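Posting here for the record, re: zinc ion.
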Amino acid sequence: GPLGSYETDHQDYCEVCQQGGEIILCDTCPRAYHMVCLDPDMEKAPEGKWSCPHCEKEGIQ
Ligand SMILES: [Zn+2]
Ligand SMILES: [Zn+2]
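Prediction output follows.
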């Protein structure tokens, strides 16, 4: 499912469940996975700019 406007083009299936549907597409990364496979604690809906939880891990923090 499309998030709307994302930077990079990416798959329409979960890399975790290996199935699409209500997956979330990082607005920056070529990643695609459902919210539940990312984090059951993640409840904040992807509104427009949604960057994957992996994004913060790709930073030099
Ligand atoms: Zn999934
Ligand atoms: Zn990302």
